[PDB]
Write a protein that binds this ligand. Structure first.
Ligand SMILES: CCCCC/C=C\C/C=C\CCCCCCCC(=O)O[C@H](COC(=O)CCCCCCCCCCCCCCC)COP(=O)([O-])OCC[N+](C)(C)C
Ligand SMILES: CCCCC/C=C\C/C=C\CCCCCCCC(=O)O[C@H](COC(=O)CCCCCCCCCCCCCCC)COP(=O)([O-])OCC[N+](C)(C)C
Ligand SMILES: CC(C)CCC[C@@H](C)[C@H]1CC[C@H]2[C@@H]3CC=C4C[C@@H](O)CC[C@]4(C)[C@H]3CC[C@]12C
Ligand SMILES: CC(C)CCC[C@@H](C)[C@H]1CC[C@H]2[C@@H]3CC=C4C[C@@H](O)CC[C@]4(C)[C@H]3CC[C@]12C
Lengths: 378, 378
């Protein structure tokens, strides 16, 4: 059981965050920088932390040995309450920064100082040299991130692949960071960054899928099993093909060279291909569903740890829907595409992708515990 | 150990209460009825509940068998966390009502209904017929209150005398209620109730002291022990003398009878008398300190359970100051001695009196557990 003081802190942070969110909404309805884009990354990170705490709680309840799957220390483990506490505290900081930006309480301090301080403090907390807060977990996360970003140089384990998938679900943060860099470089044609797109933008969008693709190639080289690793690599490269076709279509829309429609057709066909590939991989391989052996459970795996099959069915439906939504969101953010509705579409879709990745984490850990689908254990 | 969900709720309520207090302070700084009088009772009740939770925690930590002193059922005991939860929820409701009054969010709904309903809920929370929200403790409290108010009829146990003392420390609530009744009756001469003082106000001021005095007389009759019960009865009657002399002086000021200075001197004499009487009784009898037996602890009883004697000395000093403060508060509130600043002085003093009674409960329960100071046990 978690410490009583930890539960008290979790409750206090949740309450403060709720009241701050209510105040923010009231100020927005009643009462220079792209605040939405600046704060989208922080909001998505807080949501991801909260959903990860929920994932840990559900894994513990279901009996899934997520500690064994992630190779975490059996003696020392991070309770879901700790994740909830961190998410709540970061939510309070995010809401306070947003309120300060909206109100500008202190004139001398410019508005952007609040978001820069928020993000810098979050980074420092992650890389805090001292052992004040969750030092073991933070160091483990830093090592895992370093291994993941260096996908080919280090052998791939379950934790590395899982973190690479999480970063794939969090490409919106990288997109927002790149957009902010462009905004500072050029804004500070006014909206040149949003008006025009470049190859660097597509590369930033595709970096997580590139990391996953290189991880799959490394696993193929180590194990020499062509089928699964190469199929996953194709699944991840569908994203590159789609994004590059969208970029070409947008570029030739800006200047008509008689190839814009070809690029549009390529983008749409590869968008459908990527959506189908990712959805099939998630439903059949990551979750191990639709197997023939299952006789009692229809469209599900023979053994299901979670009590309800309705969970699995709703998960399949929310997986297909949000796979299509995430493909659309990546299309929207990578290129101009829809010029005015792109930002709103991406903002609405990113939390939905975070929720989809949360459900995917649930069911992937379930399948990994029941069967060695990832083949990361002897 | 309290349930984890209870701790989470306590934290949530504390955080929401803190943010609501911050919002109230901001609104007051940036921005028909005497809101202070209306809301002081609720604020004092919430503060008393929080301090009571702290008292329970301290009694449990120090080994004081407060359960046996209060004759509560050993199997079922209300933990400090539950009291904190109740106080936080009540404070949240109080702050919401005050904010609604300040902002008048609903034009159709009159302002004056916002406080009433709040207090109404509190009443319905206390008398809730359904077996919910600590129904057993609520029913025990209701029975204790009924017995205390009908003090002569029933024999005085430790719980009855303790609750009567708590009421003595919370007479400001009754005074505010009576003032509100007068304000509705007459104002709804400007400030007629505030400008003039009447006998009924003095009678209301003496209700808790009357209850304690009659309880002491009943105990004297039951046990036939003259010294303690009669000395305590005189201690409580000093308050009647002070209040009546202050009221007479105020009335004489209102209409010159040529005896105003005589009543001023009499009120001052009885005010010093009451302050000294109450302070001596609390320091020597209720707390049992300054015992001759003690040789290691100076000015303290031989056996001390609390870790620090500095706690005892600080409590002594705070009681010395706050007893005189409380007598001053009673004198001003019961009459029109300080019409310009009487309300502000009473508002500042009442929380201080509540804190003084909190410390007094601490040390009185400690002494009662150590020795049968109240002679409630054989
Ligand atoms: C694109 C922008 C950046 C994207 C975000 C990047 C990363 C965050 C995502 C996921 C974190 C990993 C979740 C754990 C999964 C394993 C299951 C489990 O719950 O295991 C936990 C591992 O705890 C963790 O890893 C920490 C959880 C996350 C805490 C968040 C820290 C602050 C982050 C601030 C923002 C950082 C970015 C800067 C802003 C731009 C068990 O803990 P333990 O103490 O047993 O650890 C083992 C330690 N031994 C082996 C030595 C005993
Ligand atoms: C204008 C008048 C204002 C109202 C009067 C003032 C204060 C009321 C509140 C508390 C006074 C009682 C404190 C007793 C503490 C003893 C030590 C202990 O903490 O032990 C507790 C005492 O439990 C209590 O009594 C409950 C404590 C208070 C909780 C809050 C109740 C709601 C109050 C709302 C007031 C609304 C008024 C509106 C305006 C009129 C043991 O708990 P148990 O669950 O074992 O209870 C015993 C149950 N058996 C005997 C069956 C096992
Ligand atoms: C609204 C629709 C489209 C979303 C899809 C259904 C959602 C609500 C389903 C999908 C997977 C489900 C989760 C699957 C597993 C668990 C673990 C269990 O111990 C508690 C419930 C919990 C946490 C479920 C809650 C409901 C859930 C999140
Ligand atoms: C006004 C100034 C001079 C003195 C103020 C002293 C106050 C703060 C002192 C008086 C009695 C003290 C309490 C006496 C006993 C306990 C029980 C212990 O387990 C925790 C601390 C606690 C709860 C103390 C906290 C501090 C306290 C409330």
């Amino acid at each position: 059981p978690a410490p009583a003081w930890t539960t008290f802190r979790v409750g206090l942070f949740c309450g403060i965050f709720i009241v701050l969110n209510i105040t923010l909404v009231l100020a927005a309805v009643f009462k220079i920088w792209p605040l939405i884009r600046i704060y989208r990354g922080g909001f998505l990170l807080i949501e991801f932390l909260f959903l990860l705490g929920i994932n840990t709680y559900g894994w513990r309840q279901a009996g899934v040995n997520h500690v064994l799957i992630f190779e975490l220390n059996p003696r020392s483990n991070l309770s879901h309450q700790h994740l909830f506490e961190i998410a709540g505290f970061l939510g309070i900081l995010w809401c306070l920064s947003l309120l300060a930006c909206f109100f500008a309480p202190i004139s001398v301090i410019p508005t952007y100082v609040y978001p820069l301080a928020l993000y810098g403090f979050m980074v420092f907390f992650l890389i805090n040299p001292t052992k004040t807060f969750y030092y073991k977990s933070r160091f483990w996360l830093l090592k895992l991130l370093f291994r993941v970003f260096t996908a080919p140089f280090h052998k791939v384990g379950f934790a590395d692949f899982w973190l690479a998938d999480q970063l794939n679900s969090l490409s919106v943060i990288l997109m927002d960071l790149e957009y902010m860099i462009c905004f500072y470089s050029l804004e500070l044609e006014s909206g040149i960054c949003h008006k025009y797109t470049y190859g660097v933008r597509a590369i930033v969008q595709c970096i997580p899928a590139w990391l996953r693709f290189i991880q799959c190639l490394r696993r193929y080289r180590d194990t020499k099993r062509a089928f699964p690793h190469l199929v996953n690599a194709g699944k991840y490269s569908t994203t590159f093909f789609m994004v590059t076709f969208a970029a070409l279509y947008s570029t030739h829309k800006e200047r008509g060279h008689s190839d814009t429609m070809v690029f549009f057709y390529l983008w749409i066909v590869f968008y459908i291909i990527s959506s189908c590939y990712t959805l099939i991989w998630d439903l059949k391989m990551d979750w191990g569903l639709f197997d023939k052996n299952a006789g009692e459970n229809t469209f599900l795996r023979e053994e299901i740890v979670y009590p309800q099959k309705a969970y699995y069915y709703c998960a399949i439906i929310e997986d297909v829907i949000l796979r299509f939504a995430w493909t659309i969101q990546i299309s929207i953010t990578s290129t101009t595409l829809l010029p005015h509705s792109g930002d709103i579409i991406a903002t609405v879709f990113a939390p939905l992708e975070v929720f989809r990745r949360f459900v995917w984490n649930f069911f992937r850990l379930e399948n990994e515990h029941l069967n060695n689908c990832g083949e990361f254990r002897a």
